[PDB]
Amino acid sequence: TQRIASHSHVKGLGLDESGLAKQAASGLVGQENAREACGVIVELIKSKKMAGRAVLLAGPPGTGKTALALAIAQELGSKVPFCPMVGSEVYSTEIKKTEVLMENFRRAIGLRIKETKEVYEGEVTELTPCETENPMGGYGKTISHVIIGLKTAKGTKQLKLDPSIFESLQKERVEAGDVIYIEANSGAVKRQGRCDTYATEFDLEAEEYVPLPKGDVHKKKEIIQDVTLHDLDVANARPQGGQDILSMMGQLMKPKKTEITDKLRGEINKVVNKYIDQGIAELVPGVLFVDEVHMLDIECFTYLHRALESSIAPIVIFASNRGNCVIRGTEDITSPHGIPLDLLDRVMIIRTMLYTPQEMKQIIKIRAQTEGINISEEALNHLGEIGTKTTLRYSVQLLTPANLLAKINGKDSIEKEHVEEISELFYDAKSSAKILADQQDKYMK
Amino acid sequence: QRIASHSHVKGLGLDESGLAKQAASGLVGQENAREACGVIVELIKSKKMAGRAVLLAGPPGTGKTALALAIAQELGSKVPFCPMVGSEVYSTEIKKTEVLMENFRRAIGLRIKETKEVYEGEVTELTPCEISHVIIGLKTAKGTKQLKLDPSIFESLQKERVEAGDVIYIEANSGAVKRQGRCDTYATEFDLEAEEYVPLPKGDVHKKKEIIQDVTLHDLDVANARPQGGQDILSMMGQLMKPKKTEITDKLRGEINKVVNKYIDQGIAELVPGVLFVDEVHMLDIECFTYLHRALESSIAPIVIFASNRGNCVIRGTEDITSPHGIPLDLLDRVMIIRTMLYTPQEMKQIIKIRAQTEGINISEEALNHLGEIGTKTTLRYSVQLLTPANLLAKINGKDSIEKEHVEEISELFYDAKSSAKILADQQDKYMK
Amino acid sequence: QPVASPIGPRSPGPSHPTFWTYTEAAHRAVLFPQQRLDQLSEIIERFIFVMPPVEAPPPSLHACHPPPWLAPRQAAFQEQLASELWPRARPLHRIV
Amino acid sequence: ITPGICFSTASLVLRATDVHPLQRIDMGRFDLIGLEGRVSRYEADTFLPRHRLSRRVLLEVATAPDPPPRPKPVKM
Amino acid sequence: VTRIERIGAHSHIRGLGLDDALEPRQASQGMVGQLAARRAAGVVLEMIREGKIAGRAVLIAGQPGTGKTAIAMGMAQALGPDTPFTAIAGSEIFSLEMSKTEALTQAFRRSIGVRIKEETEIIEGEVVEIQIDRPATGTGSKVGKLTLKTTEMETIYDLGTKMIESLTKDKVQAGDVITIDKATGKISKLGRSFTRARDYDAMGSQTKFVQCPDGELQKRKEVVHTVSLHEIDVINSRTQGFLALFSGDTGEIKSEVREQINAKVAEWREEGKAEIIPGVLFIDEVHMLDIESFSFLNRALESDMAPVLIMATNRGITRIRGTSYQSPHGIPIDLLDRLLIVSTTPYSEKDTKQILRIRCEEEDVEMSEDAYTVLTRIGLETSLRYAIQLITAASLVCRKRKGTEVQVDDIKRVYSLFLDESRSTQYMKEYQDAFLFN
Amino acid sequence: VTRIERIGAHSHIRGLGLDDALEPRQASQGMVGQLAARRAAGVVLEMIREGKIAGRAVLIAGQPGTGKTAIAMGMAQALGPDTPFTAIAGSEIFSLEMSKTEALTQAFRRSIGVRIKEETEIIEGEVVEIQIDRSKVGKLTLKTTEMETIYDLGTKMIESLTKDKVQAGDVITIDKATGKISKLGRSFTRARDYDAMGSQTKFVQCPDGELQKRKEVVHTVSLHEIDVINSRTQGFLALFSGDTGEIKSEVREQINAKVAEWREEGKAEIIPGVLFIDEVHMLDIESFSFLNRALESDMAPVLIMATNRGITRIRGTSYQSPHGIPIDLLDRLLIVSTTPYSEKDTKQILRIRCEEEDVEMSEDAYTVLTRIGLETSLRYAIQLITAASLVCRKRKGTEVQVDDIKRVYSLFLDESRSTQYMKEYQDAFLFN
Ligand SMILES: Nc1ncnc2c1ncn2[C@@H]1O[C@H](COP(=O)(O)OP(=O)(O)O)[C@@H](O)[C@H]1O
Ligand SMILES: Nc1ncnc2c1ncn2[C@@H]1O[C@H](COP(=O)(O)OP(=O)(O)O)[C@@H](O)[C@H]1O
Ligand SMILES: Nc1ncnc2c1ncn2[C@@H]1O[C@H](COP(=O)(O)OP(=O)(O)O)[C@@H](O)[C@H]1O
Ligand SMILES: Nc1ncnc2c1ncn2[C@@H]1O[C@H](COP(=O)(O)OP(=O)(O)O)[C@@H](O)[C@H]1O
Ligand SMILES: [Mg+2]
Ligand SMILES: [Mg+2]
Structure with missing residues (x-):
């Protein structure tokens, strides 16, 4: 978080309340049409009423496609799931490509569960049965309640509980002076150790003595837990915590991703729907960025057709900087973005354009501000001229070496001489390619 | 019973002299091929030759699989017949040669006599004997017997929750203890016990039954390569940790051969060589073909029937080597080729009528002629497959038989391969790739 | 131990932040193998019927004069493994 | 149910890998993976460098007489 | 939701x-x-x-x-x-x-799918009184008695040891509507006929009740197992x-x-x-x-x-x-x-328009006739899926400007924002050198 | 060495x-x-x-x-x-x-890299007596060279002590927070003069100082x-x-x-x-x-x-x-x-390599070797350094001369000469 990455300046889409894109806002410069389209897509994601919709960000490299996707993620917020993914990740040695894609699809569909957890904490001060003056059956003594006195830092309360709790109390070996907690939703007693006021400095127990609980005896809070469908699927496919031989085998064996079946996924979907109907959980469909x-x-593309046609799929964002390239896995089949025309028919294409020199200068200034670098106007103009040739990435990547060189030279700002020296020290792609071409005989292969 | 593609094939339709009747046993033509298949059936029944290979060659729809299933039906259900497709050797667990060898052993069957010892009765006494043995008392309608059993049987009895009053079945051979229920005599003691009651066994406590077990060589190989008969912890561990198939060694197969030969010599086993069909x-x-060379040259191998519809085609795994049936000439030198021919329109009409009878469909003579004409073009398979949709159309319209109008309507609704090819050629720019 | 799961680890009590992070609803959406077996009890009773055609004990290695320490070591290993693992295999008794 | 396979081999084969202790070195001086979960950084870094025995201390303890018997507890 | x-x-x-x-x-x-x-x-x-x-x-x-x-x-x-x-x-x-x-x-x-159909005996009723007597110390035979009630019956059942254990595990109390399968002894709780005693504490909020079952106690029901x-x-x-x-x-x-x-x-x-x-x-x-x-x-x-x-x-x-x-x-x-x-x-054109109308009805989007004409023309020119996507895009754009009906302007706006395959390919041809390979 | x-x-x-x-x-x-x-x-x-x-x-x-x-x-x-x-x-x-x-x-x-830093309170001493009354309650006595005290044990502490087979004379440390016990060694007494010792036992001195200690561990993972x-x-x-x-x-x-x-x-x-x-x-x-x-x-x-x-x-x-x-x-x-x-850079690199390998070379040898390195490659010259050193030591010399370099140049071929010799006999080699 403290380290500055390549998209550390993107804090969202700089959109007006009417959806029009401001020239420079929220760390984004230019790309007004793409930003407006991404805002429409953000509204689509927030509407939560569409599944399997696909958007393709198409443009030359270094034109803000990843920056636009991260701006979308920032606009949605941490509540909305955002699962980044590169296309190379589908090639796994453990599961098939379709399984990887399906797992990422389920990772993008989130579920938010809201529940109230009510507990009773305290140190047991009193344990007195409530006998009945008329014993049932004539003989012996009958009890109708068990009075448990619970003491905390700022109070003491008594709880008249069901008589059946006597067995749980005996199983937990609860006695007077022990700290216990009782859960309302289950009616069970759990002994979380003994109070520390009865412990001496000569005792050696580690987890036996616990501090007296603070606060009130009756504690209730609302627990919000965010989970994804993939989390439930994986936790059910390879369960952890059992005491049977299968759980022991799972612990022993090397973990391995498995091909989760449609039966388990359907069961998980049914459980999620039941929870939603009960009012416990709210579905939070997010975004999968590929x-x-x-x-x-x-x-993978062929499977993606069925994947996107599903009614449970998230909103998928693609990105490609390719032209009329050959699809991988095919012999001499060319498609406009490296994507077969069948999948291009299922996506909405957002075009990202190249940046004018003014936009490049603005982006350089923003990146310098983010990295804590003060750059003079002449140095900024020289770096923008360097960026007119070469690329924008080269210019934003010369900022920190030049700052280091200035600091070594003893200056708090980047001057033109530092940028010139850095340009002399480091070559760009075009200059290196020219050097290689001029000496193609001396190199290898 | 559902009707499959070969449900009408009941035999080869041969006479006593081996000659082929025109229409018999669900077969219409291929008289020479049927006579050859009868010779092969007699060869299989002889149980004298080993590793004799036969190749059924011809265009698709000429009844190669029909002839293979007719050979299977002629042999009978006692003789093993293992049908495998060539695409099944590409497993992700074992090598292709291992798959071929396993199907080779699957084709050889063995009828072996076995005696089962059974302890069955109601438990009257369950006294441990400190590893702790068990002394158990069982009663039936014929007598009572007390037995001393191994600690493993006691563990099984405990796992079954067997208590005094329960009817139990013990197999002494496998040590398999099954609790069947609480004795019926105690069903009136309570009104809700959560038990399944059983009457008292009416035989003897100890019984010996002689039965015939039908197994194959592959079953023995698997049982001795992935053992699960010891009922020990190691067997369970091996089953759970190593569930995949393994490459069974030639040493295990030699040991199994020796054991089976000993069984046959003792007179308690009978070998049924059987058939493998690829x-x-x-x-x-x-x-795979190179391996099959040596496998067929073996004196243990079964009779293998091969089929192929390829013409002069490149053998898979080679760059550009082309062979008459997709089969290298070395393997073709080791096979007897049975050639199947294309069917005349009369034979097509006969087959259509037979299939209609098999599917319980009444078809008029005009409709039969129209469907045979449809089968003259396109293929016989397409003509046969239009019977059920036409029957459904006739049933919808309230007619109990197929008329020519129903066949015409179905043919209009459903295209064949040639019509679809014509449509694709006419509209090549609109379809993908 | 349960890293990245809807099931939280065994929190000692409400004093620990993990107590108020995880929900019982998430816990009830994950089924242990014993719960799965209890869910498929009727299916196991009705549809598990396939028996291997042949059943054999594992092959045994015999030598005339073996090292006198191998057999006791193997016996002790098997005994310890059985004493530690057989109680955990009881749920699969009906399947076996 | 079939009897198991009895595989008989030479008794000399089962001793092929066995090496007499006088013919092999102690490989426990290179056992790094065995130390995990048993030896701590405290033992290796702080305790053992300070409280390693010396030959002089060992000889002194061995030669010295037995220590006096431990006094019985007294409630004081 | x-x-x-x-x-x-x-x-x-x-x-x-x-x-x-x-x-x-x-x-x-x-x-x-x-x-x-x-x-x-x-x-x-x-x-x-x-x-x-x-x-x-x-x-x-x-x-x-x-x-x-x-x-x-x-x-x-x-x-x-x-x-x-x-x-x-x-x-x-x-x-x-x-x-x-x-x-x-x-x-x-x-x-x-394989479907197995069998008939089983089933007891469904309201628990009136359940009593379980167990030995104070050591292994012994628990003795119990359970009372079940319907609208027309009430029977007192003598309980065996295993049914006692099952009831103990299920924690069956008075007022619980339970189902008992006689063969397997499985007990499934399906609700409470009334609330528990109010004087008890740490019980939680009582849920809704379930009406007591009618008819005979021990009925016969068909159980279907499909795998x-x-x-x-x-x-x-x-x-x-x-x-x-x-x-x-x-x-x-x-x-x-x-x-x-x-x-x-x-x-x-x-x-x-x-x-x-x-x-x-x-x-x-x-x-x-x-x-x-x-x-x-x-x-x-x-x-x-x-x-x-x-x-x-x-x-x-x-x-x-x-x-x-x-x-x-x-x-x-x-x-x-x-x-x-x-x-x-x-x-055809009319089939495309009808498909668009059905999609708009499915997505709860209201569109004008002129907008339908423009969208159908776009779908014929570009593709059906592109028009379907523009449906939702224009719905969102219209909702952004505080509107109620999708007009031609919204469709033109989403046509400008989002491109089809043809226009994307044209713009890529215009900048062919900028894209990476071929 | x-x-x-x-x-x-x-x-x-x-x-x-x-x-x-x-x-x-x-x-x-x-x-x-x-x-x-x-x-x-x-x-x-x-x-x-x-x-x-x-x-x-x-x-x-x-x-x-x-x-x-x-x-x-x-x-x-x-x-x-x-x-x-x-x-x-x-x-x-x-x-x-x-x-x-x-x-x-x-x-x-x-x-x-993540450098971790954990500070933990521990008890460290030699075990004097372990008394367990009837696995319910017991007492443990620990000592240093300057201290000795007795501790009251609970159920889990007793179980942990019995599981580790802790006995008298053992030198142990106990984590106060978790209670885990690791054995450092055992004290040496006149009665513990064993003829054979187990693979894990080792004798250590009784710890000094105070029984309660703070343990600071810094490691990079x-x-x-x-x-x-x-x-x-x-x-x-x-x-x-x-x-x-x-x-x-x-x-x-x-x-x-x-x-x-x-x-x-x-x-x-x-x-x-x-x-x-x-x-x-x-x-x-x-x-x-x-x-x-x-x-x-x-x-x-x-x-x-x-x-x-x-x-x-x-x-x-x-x-x-x-x-x-x-x-x-x-x-x-x-x-x-x-x-x-350049030639000067190649000669300086050769000098550094010779100094690294402890080889003495004459200036004429340096000139010849630099010429070879420019003609063929720098790595070939570096290898010839050791080859010429070996040849010089074989003839009981002390400084590499031009003769040694020429000898190793004739003995060992670079890529160009080997390729030329192969082209002379191309048909002899396989799969050209
Ligand atoms: N319009 C923009 N506004 C602000 N920063 C941008 C813009 N476009 C690109 N950048 C930044 O410049 C760098 C170029 O990378 P990027 O354009 O995202 O690559 P790609 O074109 O492959 O998505 C990124 O780190 C991004 O943060
Ligand atoms: N001579 C025949 N008599 C009756 N039915 C036949 C005959 N030949 C083929 N059939 C039927 O036609 C279909 C095609 O047969 P099949 O053996 O699958 O063709 P092939 O094996 O040549 O591809 C099968 O369903 C079969 O039942
Ligand atoms: N005849 C039709 N009636 C209703 N909706 C249709 C029809 N044809 C296509 N669609 C809709 O158009 C979209 C794309 O059609 P689709 O079936 O995916 O084409 P394809 O046949 O190439 O898969 C789908 O969402 C589908 O619901
Ligand atoms: N500037 C230098 N200073 C010292 N030694 C060098 C220098 N350049 C190359 N070398 C030496 O030349 C040899 C080959 O160079 P190296 O960098 O390892 O491979 P390459 O440069 O061909 O990838 C190495 O053994 C290295 O020690
Ligand atoms: Mg499709
Ligand atoms: Mg290098």
């Missing part, structure tokens, strides 16, 4:  |  | 929309047009419902966007949950855990198969196990124990199968346990994967002879 | 030979020439040392023998052993156990190690075996959050490092595509790369790219070019 979609092969 | 042999690759 | 299932591509299709004579209506149950293809689908659906012919294969072939998957989903919705419908993609059979033939076999056997052939294979393959039912990881099931299961199911069907419910396997984009998978399909459709197989492909004369052979639809001619082909014709 | 680390191809390099202004000296710390490249390496090293910016990529490009691996080793040496430096080859990411992206993720997470530890129940074994598999992304995110929590709590510090991939041209297009977005994370180290390829074919594709690397990744990285060496 960067470098062109690295997927023809099998 | 349908799409062209889907095998050159390594 | 939004359920886990939301508005998808085929969310408006509730069935094929046919009449009794399988004559397709122009617009019913979401389906529009494709009259011949819908009639063929209805005939195939009747064949599936009859469930008498095994291993029938149907190929839905047509241009992209002609409603092949729409027709398949309509067939699936018209079948109903009783009949199995396994829908997979062609790419899904390529697995590192199992062979292609094994995956295809499992896909087939997931489409056949697929694949589930039987998995749970019989190995001891851990029941966990493999959820984790996958079945490996390759032995053919011996499957043969035993086929024999046992045939025996059960003859003995009237179980009924077979054949279903459908839908392989979308079957052109991704290779030659080996097609060859396996050739002979796998010849079994009597095979379901009806429905394929969809939009390929013309194309090279078969794994070979260098060009074939129609990417399928070998040997398999093409075993299947009936259903062609889908392209949609 | 001969230690496991011996004279290698870069043993003479101890650093980059730069001053405080990152100006390269002509010959310092074992590096000759490559002034611009060494200055660029120093700039990159300062960027690494600051640690503020994440995911910076540098490509060291040049002709073979121009010092790319030399510069990388100089950077690794100049960087302290405190900062992690994972050096892998391009071929090492092709594993049969984990995917290429998983291998690259593990390499990335091995390059970020990588993120990948924490991932492997928390992957499974005994995952630390995979830190030795390497049978890690593909770690779940959710586990990695949880561990990242926990590490941030430790960093906030003051219990851990982050030391981002360097991942050096030598001969990157062996990476496939999938690996490059993964690297494109892996560098964009906030927990990505500095990626230094080195290739000697010209405009060549990218592995896994049929396209030609300037270094074998797709231009999208090349736009994300700064390229440091190495120039070919």
